[PDB]
RNA sequence: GAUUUCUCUCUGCAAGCGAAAG
RNA sequence: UUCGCUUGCAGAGAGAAAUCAC
C-alpha cells in the first residue's frame, strides 16, 4: 500500500507549511483586445507552499487538487525525497514493536484514549490470576503500529494471523524488563503504582448481551445463533473464549475486520489459537471451511462471528448484534451479483443485469462502483480502466488476473466504462454459484422501466405462511435481466393496475438468499425441511417507454441556417450598399460568411442583448478583419435591445433581422417593426421567421408542434404575410415574400419565411441606450 | 477520538468544442 | 437561441486509506 500523497507527508511536519491557491490564465482562449465583455473561462491553478525556510510554487495545473500535491512534490524533491524513501529495516520493525509494547504497559499509558487504554484498563478488572494480563491477540490487533511493523517483518501475516502473535510474544520476551508472558496474556511485571490506578478509577465514566454467530468446522453442522454475554468484570474475549469452550481469552484469536457493506456492522471472526504460538496434546484442529471464506484468512476449529471492540475516548464497549442471517448476507455479499442485490435492498427481487443500456435506464449501483467495492473487499487494487479512441484490467499486487475489452465504443466516457465493468462482474460471478416449476393466480418493451410493488412469502406447499421480502416500490429495467426471471416474465404480461401472484414449489431462491432476507430464521429453517414453496405477489404501478437518444439530425441539404444566411447575402450583393445592421446578430454567422467574400459593404454593425453571444462574435470579427478586410472600415457590436432606439445607428442601408422577432412577444414584434421602419429608415430590410406549417414535416422522426424552448410564438404563412404587409403599407415599404428550405410551390410552403422590405419613399433626437462592447476602425 | 489524503455518486455553475428544425 | 459532448469550480452524501508528543 503505497498511496503516498505528498500532502499527508506535510502533516507529519506539523501544520507549519501553509497552502494558498492562486488562479492564473494559460492563453488557451482567443485574445481579443477592446472587448468590454468577460468570458470567464476555466482558470488554471498553481499552489503556494510556505515551509519554514524556503517556499515552493507549483507551476500551471488544471486541478486545484493536483497543484497542491505539486507544491508538496517540488517541496520534497528539493529535500531529497526524505520522507517517502524511508522504509523499514526488518530488525528495526522488531524495535518499534518492542519499544511500543514497553510504552503500552508503561504507567502513564494506562489512562490513554487509544482503544488499548480501555483494553489495558479493562485488563485490571479481569478476575483472579487473569488480572493485569491483556490477551496476546489484542496487542497485535488493536494497535496498527504493531501491524505496520508486523507486515514489514512478514507479509505472510495477512494469510496466517497467528504469526503476528508470535512476533508479539518474541518481542515481549526480548524485552522482559516490565513484561511477563503469562498463561493469561501479557502482563506488567510490577504493580501499577496505587495512585495511578486510583486516579484512574475516580474518572471511570460508567451486563449487556451481544448476539452473534457460532460457526462450526463440521460441514454437516448448522451455523447457529450463539448469544454471548459481556460483564464489566470480564474482558469481552474471555466471554467469547467461554463460548468456544476454552479457558482463557488469552487463547482467543482475532481475524481482520470485514463485512460492513454486507451486514452493516464492522466484523471480526474470533477463533482459537493453537497452543504452539502461545507457549512461545499437540493435536491441531479441523479447518473451518465457512469461517475462512467470510474473512479471507484460514481459520481452524469453531469460530464466533461478532462485531465488538472498544472505541476511542470511551471505556464503553461498542457492539452490534450479529445474527444468523447476517452471516448469509455476508456470503451473498461476496459475489458481484450478490453485492448488487444487497445494494439494491431486494435480494430475491433483483439480479445483476447482463447488459448496459444508458446510465438513465440502469437501476441500483453502477457496474463500476459495484466492481471497485468488489475488489477492495477482496484484498485487491482499484481496477484500471483503459479508454481508447473500454479496455479494463484487473490488478492485485502486481499480478494480472483479468483483462477485458468490449467491441462497441459507446459515445460516452462513463458508458463504455460501465459496460466493461459488467463483463468483468459477470466473470467473477461465475466463480460462486448463484443467479423450477410455477403455478399462477390472477407487450412491454425492452428498454423500458417498470415500477412494481411485490411481496414474497415462504410457506408449506398445500404458522406456515411467513413474509420474507416485501417492497412497496422498485423500478426494474426491462430486458437486461435486472430482476428475478419469473417475476420479469410475469410482469411483461401485466398492465398497469394489475395484481398477479404465483408460487414456486421448488423455491428458485438459493436458500442462502432466503436465509439472508428473513429475520425469524429459526422458522425459515423449519419450513425448508418440509415442502416449501415461494409465493410471489406483484402489483404493477407504472411503466416508461423506450429511451430517447436519437435527438438531432440534419434535414436540409445545406443546413437551414446557412441557406438563410446565403439568401440574405444575395440581397446584399445584388443591391450594393454601405452600412448594414444586424438586429440580433447571434454570434456573427451572417458577419462571419459576409467577411469571407469581398463585398461592397463599408461599415457593419451588430446589435444583440446576449452578452455570451456578443463575445463569441467580437473574437471572430477580430480574426476575420485581420485577413485583408476586403472592404470594411468600421465594424461595431452593441449590447442592446432592438426594441430600443439608439441614434448611433443611422443611415442604415441594408437591415438584417434574421428570425429574431419570433424570440420575443407578438407585440414586441409589432413594436420592433414600428420602430425599425419609422425611426431607423433602412433602405432595405430583411426579416426571417419560419413557416409554422412546415413543423409537421420535421416532427416526422404555448402551442403544440414548436421548434425552440425560447420562441414566444410561431407563424403560419398567412399570419406572417398579414403582419408583414400591414407594417409595410402603414410605413411606405415594398414587401415581397420568399423563404429557404423547400420551395414556394410544394404546398408545405417554405421551411422558413422571409420578407424583403424596400423603401419606396426614397424627426430625431439623441439617446444612446446601447453599450458598445467591441469596436474597430481601420487607421 | 483529532486531523488529513484519495476516491465515486448527486445537484448547482462556468467554460471549451461540435451540431441544429435557432 | 437551442441541444449534445468534454473539462474545471462549489456544496452535499457514500466509501477507502494513513499519521497522532517518545
Ligand atoms: N429584444 C432583443 N433585443 C436584441 N437581441 C435580441 C432580443 N431578443 C432576442 N435577441 C437575440 O436574438 C438572437 C436570436 S438567435 C440568432 C440568429 C441569427 N440570425 C444567427 O443565425 O446567428 C439571440 O442571439 C438573442 O440574444
Ligand atoms: Mg429562432
PDB file of C-alpha atoms in Angstrom, chain A residues 488-759:
ATOM      1  CA  UNK A 488     -39.915 -10.489 -15.161  1.00  0.00           C
ATOM      2  CA  UNK A 489     -41.836 -12.847 -17.435  1.00  0.00           C
ATOM      3  CA  UNK A 490     -44.816 -12.482 -15.131  1.00  0.00           C
ATOM      4  CA  UNK A 491     -44.734  -8.674 -15.307  1.00  0.00           C
ATOM      5  CA  UNK A 492     -44.283  -8.252 -19.056  1.00  0.00           C
ATOM      6  CA  UNK A 493     -47.849  -9.583 -19.404  1.00  0.00           C
ATOM      7  CA  UNK A 494     -49.327  -7.343 -16.776  1.00  0.00           C
ATOM      8  CA  UNK A 495     -50.579  -3.905 -17.419  1.00  0.00           C
ATOM      9  CA  UNK A 496     -50.743  -1.044 -15.024  1.00  0.00           C
ATOM     10  CA  UNK A 497     -53.102  -1.655 -12.161  1.00  0.00           C
ATOM     11  CA  UNK A 498     -52.910  -5.465 -12.098  1.00  0.00           C
ATOM     12  CA  UNK A 499     -52.072  -7.714  -9.200  1.00  0.00           C
ATOM     13  CA  UNK A 500     -50.825 -11.149 -10.240  1.00  0.00           C
ATOM     14  CA  UNK A 501     -49.468 -13.901  -7.997  1.00  0.00           C
ATOM     15  CA  UNK A 502     -47.783 -17.258  -8.395  1.00  0.00           C
ATOM     16  CA  UNK A 503     -45.649 -19.705  -6.475  1.00  0.00           C
ATOM     17  CA  UNK A 504     -42.557 -21.872  -6.913  1.00  0.00           C
ATOM     18  CA  UNK A 505     -42.993 -25.309  -5.309  1.00  0.00           C
ATOM     19  CA  UNK A 506     -39.271 -25.857  -5.635  1.00  0.00           C
ATOM     20  CA  UNK A 507     -38.069 -22.499  -4.218  1.00  0.00           C
ATOM     21  CA  UNK A 508     -35.995 -20.806  -7.003  1.00  0.00           C
ATOM     22  CA  UNK A 509     -34.248 -18.688  -4.435  1.00  0.00           C
ATOM     23  CA  UNK A 510     -30.979 -20.280  -3.365  1.00  0.00           C
ATOM     24  CA  UNK A 511     -31.536 -20.862   0.364  1.00  0.00           C
ATOM     25  CA  UNK A 512     -28.524 -18.762   1.237  1.00  0.00           C
ATOM     26  CA  UNK A 513     -30.572 -15.914  -0.225  1.00  0.00           C
ATOM     27  CA  UNK A 514     -33.776 -16.838   1.578  1.00  0.00           C
ATOM     28  CA  UNK A 515     -31.857 -17.026   4.806  1.00  0.00           C
ATOM     29  CA  UNK A 516     -30.189 -13.678   4.103  1.00  0.00           C
ATOM     30  CA  UNK A 517     -33.551 -11.940   3.669  1.00  0.00           C
ATOM     31  CA  UNK A 518     -35.516 -13.461   6.584  1.00  0.00           C
ATOM     32  CA  UNK A 519     -35.373 -12.390  10.236  1.00  0.00           C
ATOM     33  CA  UNK A 520     -37.009 -15.251  12.117  1.00  0.00           C
ATOM     34  CA  UNK A 521     -34.569 -17.704  10.615  1.00  0.00           C
ATOM     35  CA  UNK A 522     -35.443 -20.477  13.018  1.00  0.00           C
ATOM     36  CA  UNK A 523     -38.923 -20.701  11.450  1.00  0.00           C
ATOM     37  CA  UNK A 524     -37.467 -20.349   7.953  1.00  0.00           C
ATOM     38  CA  UNK A 525     -35.099 -23.286   8.684  1.00  0.00           C
ATOM     39  CA  UNK A 526     -38.033 -25.472   9.788  1.00  0.00           C
ATOM     40  CA  UNK A 527     -40.139 -24.753   6.654  1.00  0.00           C
ATOM     41  CA  UNK A 528     -37.215 -25.628   4.451  1.00  0.00           C
ATOM     42  CA  UNK A 529     -37.169 -29.258   5.802  1.00  0.00           C
ATOM     43  CA  UNK A 530     -40.760 -29.799   4.649  1.00  0.00           C
ATOM     44  CA  UNK A 531     -42.110 -28.926   1.177  1.00  0.00           C
ATOM     45  CA  UNK A 532     -41.570 -25.180   0.975  1.00  0.00           C
ATOM     46  CA  UNK A 533     -42.984 -23.040  -1.833  1.00  0.00           C
ATOM     47  CA  UNK A 534     -42.199 -19.382  -2.550  1.00  0.00           C
ATOM     48  CA  UNK A 535     -45.195 -17.108  -3.203  1.00  0.00           C
ATOM     49  CA  UNK A 536     -44.836 -14.040  -5.437  1.00  0.00           C
ATOM     50  CA  UNK A 537     -47.417 -11.200  -5.430  1.00  0.00           C
ATOM     51  CA  UNK A 538     -46.976  -8.365  -7.915  1.00  0.00           C
ATOM     52  CA  UNK A 539     -48.967  -5.191  -8.402  1.00  0.00           C
ATOM     53  CA  UNK A 540     -47.995  -3.077 -11.416  1.00  0.00           C
ATOM     54  CA  UNK A 541     -47.584   0.638 -10.742  1.00  0.00           C
ATOM     55  CA  UNK A 542     -46.165   2.275 -13.825  1.00  0.00           C
ATOM     56  CA  UNK A 543     -44.115   1.976 -16.989  1.00  0.00           C
ATOM     57  CA  UNK A 544     -41.899   4.187 -19.162  1.00  0.00           C
ATOM     58  CA  UNK A 545     -41.302   3.515 -22.864  1.00  0.00           C
ATOM     59  CA  UNK A 546     -38.005   3.221 -24.844  1.00  0.00           C
ATOM     60  CA  UNK A 547     -35.046   5.516 -24.428  1.00  0.00           C
ATOM     61  CA  UNK A 548     -34.586   8.787 -26.210  1.00  0.00           C
ATOM     62  CA  UNK A 549     -31.090   9.019 -27.719  1.00  0.00           C
ATOM     63  CA  UNK A 550     -31.781   9.984 -31.322  1.00  0.00           C
ATOM     64  CA  UNK A 551     -32.142  13.707 -30.580  1.00  0.00           C
ATOM     65  CA  UNK A 552     -30.754  15.707 -33.557  1.00  0.00           C
ATOM     66  CA  UNK A 553     -30.418  15.360 -37.337  1.00  0.00           C
ATOM     67  CA  UNK A 554     -29.559  17.405 -40.418  1.00  0.00           C
ATOM     68  CA  UNK A 555     -32.685  17.716 -42.588  1.00  0.00           C
ATOM     69  CA  UNK A 556     -31.959  20.280 -45.302  1.00  0.00           C
ATOM     70  CA  UNK A 557     -29.057  19.517 -47.644  1.00  0.00           C
ATOM     71  CA  UNK A 558     -27.244  22.705 -46.857  1.00  0.00           C
ATOM     72  CA  UNK A 559     -28.248  23.242 -43.225  1.00  0.00           C
ATOM     73  CA  UNK A 560     -31.253  25.530 -42.801  1.00  0.00           C
ATOM     74  CA  UNK A 561     -29.325  28.247 -41.005  1.00  0.00           C
ATOM     75  CA  UNK A 562     -26.765  28.610 -43.814  1.00  0.00           C
ATOM     76  CA  UNK A 563     -29.325  28.857 -46.579  1.00  0.00           C
ATOM     77  CA  UNK A 564     -30.889  31.687 -44.578  1.00  0.00           C
ATOM     78  CA  UNK A 565     -27.531  33.443 -44.431  1.00  0.00           C
ATOM     79  CA  UNK A 566     -26.858  32.802 -48.080  1.00  0.00           C
ATOM     80  CA  UNK A 567     -30.251  34.178 -49.038  1.00  0.00           C
ATOM     81  CA  UNK A 568     -29.705  37.376 -47.094  1.00  0.00           C
ATOM     82  CA  UNK A 569     -26.201  37.693 -48.598  1.00  0.00           C
ATOM     83  CA  UNK A 570     -27.548  37.558 -52.146  1.00  0.00           C
ATOM     84  CA  UNK A 571     -29.654  40.662 -51.398  1.00  0.00           C
ATOM     85  CA  UNK A 572     -26.581  42.425 -50.029  1.00  0.00           C
ATOM     86  CA  UNK A 573     -24.537  41.963 -53.234  1.00  0.00           C
ATOM     87  CA  UNK A 574     -27.498  42.311 -55.643  1.00  0.00           C
ATOM     88  CA  UNK A 575     -28.349  45.741 -54.238  1.00  0.00           C
ATOM     89  CA  UNK A 576     -24.978  47.245 -53.432  1.00  0.00           C
ATOM     90  CA  UNK A 577     -24.797  49.314 -50.256  1.00  0.00           C
ATOM     91  CA  UNK A 578     -22.604  50.702 -47.477  1.00  0.00           C
ATOM     92  CA  UNK A 579     -23.791  50.369 -43.838  1.00  0.00           C
ATOM     93  CA  UNK A 580     -25.538  47.154 -42.619  1.00  0.00           C
ATOM     94  CA  UNK A 581     -27.264  46.436 -39.336  1.00  0.00           C
ATOM     95  CA  UNK A 582     -27.731  43.038 -37.754  1.00  0.00           C
ATOM     96  CA  UNK A 583     -30.644  43.170 -35.367  1.00  0.00           C
ATOM     97  CA  UNK A 584     -29.921  40.034 -33.400  1.00  0.00           C
ATOM     98  CA  UNK A 585     -26.515  39.041 -34.701  1.00  0.00           C
ATOM     99  CA  UNK A 586     -26.192  35.830 -32.726  1.00  0.00           C
ATOM    100  CA  UNK A 587     -22.522  35.125 -32.659  1.00  0.00           C
ATOM    101  CA  UNK A 588     -21.802  36.698 -36.034  1.00  0.00           C
ATOM    102  CA  UNK A 589     -22.538  33.947 -38.605  1.00  0.00           C
ATOM    103  CA  UNK A 590     -24.043  36.498 -41.032  1.00  0.00           C
ATOM    104  CA  UNK A 591     -20.947  38.617 -40.407  1.00  0.00           C
ATOM    105  CA  UNK A 592     -18.759  35.551 -40.499  1.00  0.00           C
ATOM    106  CA  UNK A 593     -19.836  34.494 -44.008  1.00  0.00           C
ATOM    107  CA  UNK A 594     -20.129  38.135 -45.068  1.00  0.00           C
ATOM    108  CA  UNK A 595     -16.438  38.987 -44.445  1.00  0.00           C
ATOM    109  CA  UNK A 596     -15.214  35.794 -46.143  1.00  0.00           C
ATOM    110  CA  UNK A 597     -16.063  37.240 -49.540  1.00  0.00           C
ATOM    111  CA  UNK A 598     -15.134  40.634 -50.993  1.00  0.00           C
ATOM    112  CA  UNK A 599     -18.421  42.508 -50.528  1.00  0.00           C
ATOM    113  CA  UNK A 600     -19.037  46.179 -51.335  1.00  0.00           C
ATOM    114  CA  UNK A 601     -20.068  47.000 -47.774  1.00  0.00           C
ATOM    115  CA  UNK A 602     -18.494  49.918 -45.951  1.00  0.00           C
ATOM    116  CA  UNK A 603     -19.275  49.708 -42.227  1.00  0.00           C
ATOM    117  CA  UNK A 604     -21.008  46.898 -40.276  1.00  0.00           C
ATOM    118  CA  UNK A 605     -22.926  46.868 -37.030  1.00  0.00           C
ATOM    119  CA  UNK A 606     -24.256  44.120 -34.866  1.00  0.00           C
ATOM    120  CA  UNK A 607     -26.797  44.508 -32.076  1.00  0.00           C
ATOM    121  CA  UNK A 608     -27.770  41.876 -29.559  1.00  0.00           C
ATOM    122  CA  UNK A 609     -28.923  41.563 -25.993  1.00  0.00           C
ATOM    123  CA  UNK A 610     -26.916  38.381 -25.333  1.00  0.00           C
ATOM    124  CA  UNK A 611     -23.528  39.025 -23.652  1.00  0.00           C
ATOM    125  CA  UNK A 612     -22.444  35.422 -24.167  1.00  0.00           C
ATOM    126  CA  UNK A 613     -23.185  35.796 -27.862  1.00  0.00           C
ATOM    127  CA  UNK A 614     -21.601  39.177 -28.459  1.00  0.00           C
ATOM    128  CA  UNK A 615     -18.404  37.724 -27.033  1.00  0.00           C
ATOM    129  CA  UNK A 616     -18.093  34.840 -29.500  1.00  0.00           C
ATOM    130  CA  UNK A 617     -18.697  37.323 -32.318  1.00  0.00           C
ATOM    131  CA  UNK A 618     -16.205  40.019 -31.384  1.00  0.00           C
ATOM    132  CA  UNK A 619     -13.487  37.373 -31.232  1.00  0.00           C
ATOM    133  CA  UNK A 620     -14.498  36.152 -34.706  1.00  0.00           C
ATOM    134  CA  UNK A 621     -14.523  39.697 -36.108  1.00  0.00           C
ATOM    135  CA  UNK A 622     -11.102  40.226 -34.642  1.00  0.00           C
ATOM    136  CA  UNK A 623      -9.721  37.305 -36.610  1.00  0.00           C
ATOM    137  CA  UNK A 624     -11.815  37.984 -39.756  1.00  0.00           C
ATOM    138  CA  UNK A 625     -10.832  41.645 -40.120  1.00  0.00           C
ATOM    139  CA  UNK A 626      -7.146  40.688 -39.739  1.00  0.00           C
ATOM    140  CA  UNK A 627      -7.069  38.784 -43.032  1.00  0.00           C
ATOM    141  CA  UNK A 628      -7.358  41.589 -45.588  1.00  0.00           C
ATOM    142  CA  UNK A 629     -10.827  43.039 -44.817  1.00  0.00           C
ATOM    143  CA  UNK A 630     -11.650  43.441 -48.454  1.00  0.00           C
ATOM    144  CA  UNK A 631     -13.974  46.446 -47.939  1.00  0.00           C
ATOM    145  CA  UNK A 632     -14.830  47.178 -44.288  1.00  0.00           C
ATOM    146  CA  UNK A 633     -13.693  50.193 -42.287  1.00  0.00           C
ATOM    147  CA  UNK A 634     -15.726  50.259 -39.065  1.00  0.00           C
ATOM    148  CA  UNK A 635     -17.172  47.115 -37.545  1.00  0.00           C
ATOM    149  CA  UNK A 636     -19.160  47.541 -34.321  1.00  0.00           C
ATOM    150  CA  UNK A 637     -21.057  45.375 -31.771  1.00  0.00           C
ATOM    151  CA  UNK A 638     -23.728  46.802 -29.450  1.00  0.00           C
ATOM    152  CA  UNK A 639     -25.165  45.058 -26.407  1.00  0.00           C
ATOM    153  CA  UNK A 640     -28.715  46.369 -26.628  1.00  0.00           C
ATOM    154  CA  UNK A 641     -32.389  45.627 -27.179  1.00  0.00           C
ATOM    155  CA  UNK A 642     -33.534  46.010 -30.799  1.00  0.00           C
ATOM    156  CA  UNK A 643     -36.813  47.045 -29.219  1.00  0.00           C
ATOM    157  CA  UNK A 644     -34.935  50.228 -28.443  1.00  0.00           C
ATOM    158  CA  UNK A 645     -33.859  53.257 -30.409  1.00  0.00           C
ATOM    159  CA  UNK A 646     -30.243  54.325 -30.469  1.00  0.00           C
ATOM    160  CA  UNK A 647     -29.236  57.362 -32.505  1.00  0.00           C
ATOM    161  CA  UNK A 648     -25.797  55.939 -33.199  1.00  0.00           C
ATOM    162  CA  UNK A 649     -27.234  53.686 -35.843  1.00  0.00           C
ATOM    163  CA  UNK A 650     -28.474  55.922 -38.601  1.00  0.00           C
ATOM    164  CA  UNK A 651     -28.164  55.922 -42.383  1.00  0.00           C
ATOM    165  CA  UNK A 652     -28.749  52.180 -42.409  1.00  0.00           C
ATOM    166  CA  UNK A 653     -28.955  50.922 -45.899  1.00  0.00           C
ATOM    167  CA  UNK A 654     -29.412  47.130 -45.547  1.00  0.00           C
ATOM    168  CA  UNK A 655     -31.207  45.852 -42.475  1.00  0.00           C
ATOM    169  CA  UNK A 656     -30.963  42.364 -41.129  1.00  0.00           C
ATOM    170  CA  UNK A 657     -33.170  40.766 -38.546  1.00  0.00           C
ATOM    171  CA  UNK A 658     -32.826  37.056 -39.229  1.00  0.00           C
ATOM    172  CA  UNK A 659     -35.573  35.325 -37.282  1.00  0.00           C
ATOM    173  CA  UNK A 660     -35.173  37.221 -34.033  1.00  0.00           C
ATOM    174  CA  UNK A 661     -38.714  38.635 -33.874  1.00  0.00           C
ATOM    175  CA  UNK A 662     -40.184  35.233 -33.095  1.00  0.00           C
ATOM    176  CA  UNK A 663     -37.971  35.162 -29.981  1.00  0.00           C
ATOM    177  CA  UNK A 664     -39.928  37.969 -28.311  1.00  0.00           C
ATOM    178  CA  UNK A 665     -43.632  38.904 -27.803  1.00  0.00           C
ATOM    179  CA  UNK A 666     -46.183  39.256 -30.525  1.00  0.00           C
ATOM    180  CA  UNK A 667     -46.493  42.945 -29.654  1.00  0.00           C
ATOM    181  CA  UNK A 668     -42.761  43.257 -29.248  1.00  0.00           C
ATOM    182  CA  UNK A 669     -42.703  42.020 -32.798  1.00  0.00           C
ATOM    183  CA  UNK A 670     -45.032  44.813 -33.854  1.00  0.00           C
ATOM    184  CA  UNK A 671     -43.283  47.485 -31.760  1.00  0.00           C
ATOM    185  CA  UNK A 672     -39.943  46.421 -33.250  1.00  0.00           C
ATOM    186  CA  UNK A 673     -41.441  46.615 -36.722  1.00  0.00           C
ATOM    187  CA  UNK A 674     -42.858  50.058 -35.933  1.00  0.00           C
ATOM    188  CA  UNK A 675     -39.570  51.459 -34.705  1.00  0.00           C
ATOM    189  CA  UNK A 676     -37.253  49.925 -37.305  1.00  0.00           C
ATOM    190  CA  UNK A 677     -39.251  51.171 -40.246  1.00  0.00           C
ATOM    191  CA  UNK A 678     -40.170  54.600 -38.809  1.00  0.00           C
ATOM    192  CA  UNK A 679     -37.083  55.546 -36.806  1.00  0.00           C
ATOM    193  CA  UNK A 680     -34.082  53.964 -38.473  1.00  0.00           C
ATOM    194  CA  UNK A 681     -35.358  54.232 -42.047  1.00  0.00           C
ATOM    195  CA  UNK A 682     -33.495  51.278 -43.521  1.00  0.00           C
ATOM    196  CA  UNK A 683     -33.351  51.461 -47.313  1.00  0.00           C
ATOM    197  CA  UNK A 684     -33.788  47.712 -47.342  1.00  0.00           C
ATOM    198  CA  UNK A 685     -34.876  45.316 -44.557  1.00  0.00           C
ATOM    199  CA  UNK A 686     -34.802  41.513 -44.467  1.00  0.00           C
ATOM    200  CA  UNK A 687     -36.845  39.568 -41.881  1.00  0.00           C
ATOM    201  CA  UNK A 688     -36.938  35.843 -41.450  1.00  0.00           C
ATOM    202  CA  UNK A 689     -39.152  33.674 -39.257  1.00  0.00           C
ATOM    203  CA  UNK A 690     -40.073  30.159 -40.080  1.00  0.00           C
ATOM    204  CA  UNK A 691     -43.278  28.964 -41.663  1.00  0.00           C
ATOM    205  CA  UNK A 692     -45.190  27.094 -38.889  1.00  0.00           C
ATOM    206  CA  UNK A 693     -46.907  24.671 -41.238  1.00  0.00           C
ATOM    207  CA  UNK A 694     -43.521  23.138 -42.003  1.00  0.00           C
ATOM    208  CA  UNK A 695     -43.098  21.809 -38.373  1.00  0.00           C
ATOM    209  CA  UNK A 696     -45.473  18.958 -39.244  1.00  0.00           C
ATOM    210  CA  UNK A 697     -42.881  17.594 -41.644  1.00  0.00           C
ATOM    211  CA  UNK A 698     -39.964  17.917 -39.202  1.00  0.00           C
ATOM    212  CA  UNK A 699     -41.849  16.206 -36.364  1.00  0.00           C
ATOM    213  CA  UNK A 700     -41.762  13.129 -38.593  1.00  0.00           C
ATOM    214  CA  UNK A 701     -38.773  11.424 -36.819  1.00  0.00           C
ATOM    215  CA  UNK A 702     -47.685  27.620 -25.740  1.00  0.00           C
ATOM    216  CA  UNK A 703     -48.567  25.943 -28.857  1.00  0.00           C
ATOM    217  CA  UNK A 704     -48.121  22.384 -29.865  1.00  0.00           C
ATOM    218  CA  UNK A 705     -45.558  21.449 -32.560  1.00  0.00           C
ATOM    219  CA  UNK A 706     -42.990  24.218 -31.550  1.00  0.00           C
ATOM    220  CA  UNK A 707     -39.264  24.389 -32.595  1.00  0.00           C
ATOM    221  CA  UNK A 708     -37.277  26.150 -29.681  1.00  0.00           C
ATOM    222  CA  UNK A 709     -37.953  26.320 -25.931  1.00  0.00           C
ATOM    223  CA  UNK A 710     -37.409  30.034 -26.428  1.00  0.00           C
ATOM    224  CA  UNK A 711     -39.760  31.032 -29.247  1.00  0.00           C
ATOM    225  CA  UNK A 712     -42.666  33.042 -27.812  1.00  0.00           C
ATOM    226  CA  UNK A 713     -44.733  32.212 -30.893  1.00  0.00           C
ATOM    227  CA  UNK A 714     -44.528  30.883 -34.431  1.00  0.00           C
ATOM    228  CA  UNK A 715     -46.391  31.924 -37.520  1.00  0.00           C
ATOM    229  CA  UNK A 716     -48.217  30.446 -40.480  1.00  0.00           C
ATOM    230  CA  UNK A 717     -47.509  31.851 -43.920  1.00  0.00           C
ATOM    231  CA  UNK A 718     -50.755  33.798 -43.662  1.00  0.00           C
ATOM    232  CA  UNK A 719     -50.017  35.110 -40.192  1.00  0.00           C
ATOM    233  CA  UNK A 720     -46.597  36.383 -41.228  1.00  0.00           C
ATOM    234  CA  UNK A 721     -47.790  37.699 -44.555  1.00  0.00           C
ATOM    235  CA  UNK A 722     -50.527  39.705 -42.791  1.00  0.00           C
ATOM    236  CA  UNK A 723     -48.319  41.269 -40.108  1.00  0.00           C
ATOM    237  CA  UNK A 724     -45.697  41.842 -42.791  1.00  0.00           C
ATOM    238  CA  UNK A 725     -47.952  43.660 -45.250  1.00  0.00           C
ATOM    239  CA  UNK A 726     -49.776  45.692 -42.601  1.00  0.00           C
ATOM    240  CA  UNK A 727     -46.500  47.101 -41.393  1.00  0.00           C
ATOM    241  CA  UNK A 728     -45.310  47.621 -44.974  1.00  0.00           C
ATOM    242  CA  UNK A 729     -48.284  49.686 -46.153  1.00  0.00           C
ATOM    243  CA  UNK A 730     -48.547  51.674 -42.972  1.00  0.00           C
ATOM    244  CA  UNK A 731     -44.896  52.787 -43.465  1.00  0.00           C
ATOM    245  CA  UNK A 732     -44.396  53.093 -47.286  1.00  0.00           C
ATOM    246  CA  UNK A 733     -42.479  49.895 -47.832  1.00  0.00           C
ATOM    247  CA  UNK A 734     -42.449  47.416 -50.695  1.00  0.00           C
ATOM    248  CA  UNK A 735     -42.804  43.886 -49.354  1.00  0.00           C
ATOM    249  CA  UNK A 736     -42.002  40.679 -51.190  1.00  0.00           C
ATOM    250  CA  UNK A 737     -42.104  37.215 -49.626  1.00  0.00           C
ATOM    251  CA  UNK A 738     -39.931  34.134 -50.077  1.00  0.00           C
ATOM    252  CA  UNK A 739     -38.215  31.546 -47.953  1.00  0.00           C
ATOM    253  CA  UNK A 740     -35.421  28.993 -47.520  1.00  0.00           C
ATOM    254  CA  UNK A 741     -35.920  25.239 -47.270  1.00  0.00           C
ATOM    255  CA  UNK A 742     -38.385  23.751 -49.738  1.00  0.00           C
ATOM    256  CA  UNK A 743     -39.982  25.982 -52.378  1.00  0.00           C
ATOM    257  CA  UNK A 744     -42.999  28.271 -52.676  1.00  0.00           C
ATOM    258  CA  UNK A 745     -44.731  25.725 -54.922  1.00  0.00           C
ATOM    259  CA  UNK A 746     -44.846  22.462 -52.935  1.00  0.00           C
ATOM    260  CA  UNK A 747     -47.764  23.075 -50.531  1.00  0.00           C
ATOM    261  CA  UNK A 748     -45.861  22.879 -47.260  1.00  0.00           C
ATOM    262  CA  UNK A 749     -44.570  26.342 -48.221  1.00  0.00           C
ATOM    263  CA  UNK A 750     -41.024  27.452 -47.484  1.00  0.00           C
ATOM    264  CA  UNK A 751     -39.449  25.995 -44.346  1.00  0.00           C
ATOM    265  CA  UNK A 752     -38.551  29.488 -43.162  1.00  0.00           C
ATOM    266  CA  UNK A 753     -40.257  32.720 -44.250  1.00  0.00           C
ATOM    267  CA  UNK A 754     -38.542  35.879 -45.487  1.00  0.00           C
ATOM    268  CA  UNK A 755     -39.868  39.363 -46.104  1.00  0.00           C
ATOM    269  CA  UNK A 756     -37.938  41.983 -48.019  1.00  0.00           C
ATOM    270  CA  UNK A 757     -38.988  45.498 -47.072  1.00  0.00           C
ATOM    271  CA  UNK A 758     -37.985  48.018 -49.692  1.00  0.00           C
ATOM    272  CA  UNK A 759     -38.067  51.766 -49.105  1.00  0.00           C
TER     273      UNK A 759
END
